[PDB]
């Protein structure tokens, strides 16, 4: 009863702390621990919602209890789920886990603009980046031109996450960087569901295989190929070519 509870999400992140009398993750010393089991946001939570989490490192666990060291600076984070019109209350405050793992630079893919790259070598199944954005409906997205739908990502059957211009510029939005991954029919990453303590229910980019430092991260965009394909022209072209090599 003076013990510690760990609750893992399927994505591998967890909440950890002493639960209250009702069995809720509520207290001043609750933590969210990212999937590396090392990076943590440690502080005040109410029923598992982050009110004020300070950046920390999980240094060891003893008898199941985590022991944290706070990182320098006064890096604090709070639950801040996007709405249909607001992407983030701190658009320029990077996610600390993501910022150690990826960076944005010119893509190696011809004519594809910027892309997402690994900062370090990592193994398979590694969460690399987070896909956050404004939350709009499939009806809104499907009713408008492809020119407006470059950055849209389906979250589930009710919600599409979008990063509307000009938040597609890293100088205007860099809280998450997952929208920067380019498409490949032979990708090294996939989208997966992710429950984030700041962003809420979103998607992440996870590696399929080991990746080297400075390797471009790509995902299969997964547009419907036989509703020709409902897709931008650059994708339709690439699809034909891909089918050829097959």
């Amino acid at each position: 009863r003076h013990g510690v509870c760990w609750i893992y999400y399927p994505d591998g992140g967890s909440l950890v702390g002493e639960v209250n009398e009702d069995g809720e993750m509520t207290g001043e010393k609750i933590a969210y621990v990212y999937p590396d089991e090392r990076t943590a946001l440690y502080g005040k939570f109410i029923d598992g919602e982050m009110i004020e989490g300070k950046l920390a490192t999980l240094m060891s666990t003893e008898e199941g209890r985590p022991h944290f060291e706070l990182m320098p600076g006064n890096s604090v984070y709070h639950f801040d789920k996007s709405t249909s019109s607001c992407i983030s209350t701190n658009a320029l405050l990077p996610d600390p886990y993501e910022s150690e793992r990826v960076y944005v630079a010119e893509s190696l893919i011809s004519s594809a603009g910027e892309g997402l790259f690994s900062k370090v070598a990592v193994g398979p199944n590694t969460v690399m980046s987070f896909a956050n954005g404004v939350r709009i409906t499939h009806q809104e997205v499907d009713s408008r031109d492809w020119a407006l739908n470059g950055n849209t990502l389906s979250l589930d059957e009710e919600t599409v996450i979008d990063v509307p211009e000009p938040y597609n510029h890293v100088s205007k939005y860099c809280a998450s960087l997952g929208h920067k991954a380019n498409h490949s029919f032979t990708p090294n990453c996939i989208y997966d569901m992710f429950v984030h303590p700041r962003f809420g229910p979103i998607k992440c980019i996870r590696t399929l295989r080991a990746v080297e430092a400075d390797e471009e991260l790509t995902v299969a965009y997964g547009y419907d190929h036989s509703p020709g394909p409902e897709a931008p022209e650059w994708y339709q072209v690439e699809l034909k070519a891909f089918q050829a090599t097959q």
Binding site: H138, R144, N149, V160, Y221, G222
Partner: peptide, 8 residues
């Protein structure tokens, strides 16, 4: 759908 990664 005009979005990535929809389950069809």
């Amino acid at each position: 759908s005009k979005s990535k990664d929809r389950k069809y």
